[PDB]
């Protein structure tokens, strides 16, 4: 039940792939290809997911899977 264990879910889900698909060193921008309609729904959800207002700054390490899992893990700190 690692941090990403919860991020991968909503993540892969936001895209439409099992949590197993969502790798670590991947990319939800190219690897998968999440249009601006999939990426958004991703963050929007990710936020409420843990009731958090992802700040612009933090809006940097959230282009792939692990990335998000890292943000939800301990937040870019």
Looking up tokens 């940097």 gives: 60
The catalytic residue among 31, 35, 38, 56 is 35
Tokens found for residue 51: 């009731």
Spell out the residues 6+ positions from residue 50 whose beta carbon is closer than 8 angstroms to its own.
6, 72
Looking up tokens 């301990």 gives: 74
3-state secondary structure the chain: CCHHHHHHHHHHHHHCCCCCCCCCCCCCCCCCCCCHHHHHHHHHHHHHHCCCCCCCCCCCCCCCHHHHHHHHHHCCC
Give the C-alpha distances (Å, rounded to integers) separating 74 from 16, 18, 41, 43: 25, 23, 21, 16
Integer Cα distance of 69 and 8 in angstroms: 6
CATH class of 1-77: mainly alpha
Tokens found for residue 35: 């249009």
**Catalytic status, residue 35:** yes
Per this entry, what is the length of the chain?
77
**Residue-range domain boundaries for the chain:** 1-77
């Amino acid at each position: 039940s690692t941090i990403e264990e919860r991020v991968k879910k909503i993540i892969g889900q936001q895209l439409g792939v099992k949590q197993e698909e969502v790798t670590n060193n991947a990319s939800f921008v190219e690897d998968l290809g999440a249009d601006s309609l999939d990426t958004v729904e991703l963050v929007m959800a990710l936020e409420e997911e843990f009731d958090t207002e992802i700040p612009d700054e933090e809006a940097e390490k959230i282009t792939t899977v692990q990335a998000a899992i890292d943000y939800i893990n301990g937040h870019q700190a």
